[PDB]
């Protein structure tokens, strides 16, 4: 539930298993990189 896949789109920091929701540069899409 709270945990999210690796490259699946996230919304904010943490709130996934990766815990690090960084964005690539100017990209809007954020994922648990």
């Amino acid at each position: 539930g709270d945990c999210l896949p690796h490259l699946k789109r996230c919304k904010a920091d943490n709130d996934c298993c990766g815990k690090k929701c960084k964005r690539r540069g100017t990209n809007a899409e954020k994922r648990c990189r």
Binding site: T26, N27, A28, E29
Partner: protein
């Protein structure tokens, strides 16, 4: 037709920043502002290439991100702004053919036209039409959007006076600029000019008319017993000249007026395209999104450059001779101010450190010391501080663009007026 944009702005705002606890109140405020929005509508060579890119840019701008004496002027205000933008683009395009020469038409600003002698009269007519359309836009704004903002201000004042009773009991004039300004409208007999409730004074004189003297509230709010509401007039002037959009339109009008003194003043009107399209506005606002951190980083860079400058001033003084001629030298570090200017101006923009310009330390004392000096300067400035400054703005712009996508996703994912997701709705 026009209230749709206000609706989009409202919903985007509430999803982006509006909390869940005040969503109903924000909907109520939006609906109250929206009912009378319908009543307002009911009452209403290099030349060829330069031309090619100019036409392409105009096409891209147009495609994405574009009682009757005020009737036709009110519905066409949005098109009037596009017409003004077209005139600004045209005059900017004609401004690219300027030249300077000493011969008669003291440097002079004249025109170089390929047998097109109708260019200067065209520019004059375009400037006149541009100032005329700016005047028309500033005339239409006070009748199109000013009533909405003054009605919102009256709404918030009425809510404060009724539910909170700030003016009679709290009386916070000194604390805020608005509190001082709103004191004048209370005594005016024409307070509910735009507000639907014309009897907002008969409610608060019995809501708080027992603990506090009624004779004080009656005089405070103008309760008594051609038509010149002076205090309401100055209040209206204050709110309209304090408005951000009104201030921007007034700045545009004054720039258009100043453009008659010199046509080059019209170049400032090219910034209207930035506000027209969302992404250019995002680019502009990314700098100010992290303004405090950006200014602090710039200050840290400045003090680091100052430390490097004083270190050079004490020791590496003879290495700052820019002039190649031995008879006449150009000493850039003979003064702390000049050395600091050279370090901030040339060293930061060098891209490889301050040492690319100043003399080679080979074959002289302080050789390895200066090698370390320039290595540290390069690493600490260009590798670190400039990269961090660029990255802060890049991340701010990326997150600002991401915010709109997230707003759309929450729009299409969960029920806004129910709070439940679409998984159950299906």
């Amino acid at each position: 037709p026009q209230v749709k944009e206000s609706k989009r702005q409202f919903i985007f705002d509430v999803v982006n920043e509006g909390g869940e606890a005040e969503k109903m109140e924000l909907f109520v405020s939006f609906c109250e502002d929206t009912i009378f929005e319908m009543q307002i509508a009911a009452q209403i060579t290099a030349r060829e290439a330069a031309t090619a890119l100019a036409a392409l840019l105009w096409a891209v701008v147009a495609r994405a991100g574009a009682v009757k004496f005020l009737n036709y002027l009110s519905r066409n205000f949005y098109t009037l702004r596009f017409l003004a933008l077209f005139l600004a683009f045209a005059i900017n395009f004609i401004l690219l053919f300027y030249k300077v020469s000493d011969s008669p038409p003291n440097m002079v600003y004249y025109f170089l036209e390929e047998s097109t002698g109708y260019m200067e009269p065209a520019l004059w007519c375009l400037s006149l039409l541009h100032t005329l359309v700016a005047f028309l836009c500033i005339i239409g704004y006070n009748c199109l959007k000013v009533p909405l903002v003054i009605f919102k201000r009256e709404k918030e004042l009425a809510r404060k006076l009724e539910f909170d009773g700030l003016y009679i009991t709290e009386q916070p004039g000194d604390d805020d600029v608005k509190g001082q300004w709103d004191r004048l409208v209370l005594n005016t007999p024409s307070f509910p000019s735009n507000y639907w409730d014309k009897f907002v004074k008969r409610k608060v004189l019995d809501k708080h008319g027992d603990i506090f003297g009624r004779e004080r509230i009656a005089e405070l709010l103008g309760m008594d017993l051609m038509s010149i509401d002076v205090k309401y007039q100055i209040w209206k002037f204050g709110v309209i000249f304090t408005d951000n959009s009104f201030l921007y339109l007034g700045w545009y009008m004054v720039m258009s007026l100043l453009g008659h003194y010199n046509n080059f003043f019209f170049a400032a009107h090219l910034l209207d395209i930035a506000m027209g399209v969302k992404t250019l506005r995002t680019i502009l606002s990314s700098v100010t999104h992290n303004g405090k951190q950006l200014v602090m980083t710039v200050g840290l860079l400045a003090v680091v450059v100052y430390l490097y400058t004083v270190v050079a001033f004490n020791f590496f003084r003879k290495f700052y001779n820019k002039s190649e001629d031995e008879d006449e030298p150009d000493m850039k570090c003979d003064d702390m101010m000049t050395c600091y200017l050279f370090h901030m101006y040339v060293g930061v923009r060098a891209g490889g450190g301050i040492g690319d310009e100043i003399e080679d330390p080979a074959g002289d004392e302080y050789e390895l010391y200066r090698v370390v000096f320039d290595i540290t300067f390069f690493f600490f400035v260009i590798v670190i501080l400039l990269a961090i400054i660029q990255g802060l703005i890049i991340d701010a712009f990326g997150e600002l663009r991401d915010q709109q996508e997230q707003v759309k996703e929450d729009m299409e994912t969960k029920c806004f007026i129910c709070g439940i997701g679409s998984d159950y709705f299906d």
